[PDB]
Amino acid sequence: EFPLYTIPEKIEKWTPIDMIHLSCPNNLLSEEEGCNAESSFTYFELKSGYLAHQKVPGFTCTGAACRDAYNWKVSLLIISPSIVEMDIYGRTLHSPMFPSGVCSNVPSCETNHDYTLWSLSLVCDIFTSSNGKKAMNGSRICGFKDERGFYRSLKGACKLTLCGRPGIRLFDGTWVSFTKPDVHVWCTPNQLINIHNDRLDEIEHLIVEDIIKKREECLDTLETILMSQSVSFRRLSHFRKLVPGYGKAYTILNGSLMETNVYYKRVDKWADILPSKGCLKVGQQCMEPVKGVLFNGIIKGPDGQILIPEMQSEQLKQHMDLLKAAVFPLRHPLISRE
């Protein structure tokens, strides 16, 4: 996932360059795992909104004949209704009337009475086919973008068959199902998938649009730098690569624009980069600021102030907090016996 911030591993050189040489990172996760191909496909998700506790409808037969007796009672002592729970994970049935609380098979089950015993498609129709785009490097699929554009990588993804449908559980916990994902692990059953509600969709689309807005703001900055033949140091904060990877770093030193090749490593908490108020951790030791300028728009504060990255923006992090809080896993029923 998109980190909160990206810090260079270590600054090596500072070679002054021309301003037109600037180029916005265009940061993508597809091309960061080495997947520049992108194909359109149709995957499967849970039905939108709270989709759990299937509550299967059935009847009890008191001693194929039981189906004739039930159809006759609609228009052997049939006792109905006998609504039972279903764990969608293994197509499991749940009720204390079952011997030890669980019946798992496949069209008929048992009961705590040997004289009275207890379709399966309508209750298990809990999926929507939706449109997505998978990133490919030839045959390999690095990851996919869902319907509302959020990119999930398959690194850390397992296999998990919800309600008799082969699918995969992503690293964050969502569940999709498409043809040939090339997954190998199989997902210890204590791992859970998440709800698919419309708030999830809205917040995801908001993070998508926030990222595209990042790149468009960068492009606007460069477009102004060209027709202005001048560049403000704080505007350099727009040219940071948002994801970890090999990129460039920029600074305005000695009155000129300088760049360097550098490796961006993750920053998901502010405290790591500035443990000591005054210090900015680049590598092992803190690096020295000069003349009221650090790099990438980070400033030495004029007076009684300290290294100030653009931590005032805080709009992507807001929507990612809203996303991380608004997810809820789908747990199993309770097993109740006698």
Numbering used by the authors: 1 to 63, 92 to 103, 132 to 162, 167 to 178, 184 to 403
The authors write:
We also crystallized MOKV-G-ecto at pH 4.0 and determined the structure at 3.2 Å resolution. Three monomers were present in the asymmetric unit but were not arranged in a trimer. They interact via crystal contacts that are unlikely of biological relevance. The overall domain-arrangement mode in the structure is similar to that observed in the post-fusion structure of VSV-G, as indicated by the extended linear conformation and the proximity of CTR to FD. This allows the F2 helix to be arranged in parallel to helix C. Consequently, the CTR loop is shown to extend over domains PHD and FD, enabling multiple amino acid interactions between CTR and PHD-FD along the interface. The CTR residue H397 forms a salt-bridge with D143 in FD. Finally, hydrophobic interactions among residues Y145, L257-I260, P394, L395 and P398 also contribute to stabilize the post-fusion architecture.
Glycoprotein (G), as the sole protein on the virion surface, is a key factor mediating lyssavirus invasion. The lyssavirus G, which belongs to the rhabdovirus G family, has been defined as a class III viral membrane-fusion protein. Similar to its vesiculovirus homolog, RABV-G also consists of three domains: FD, PHD, and CD.
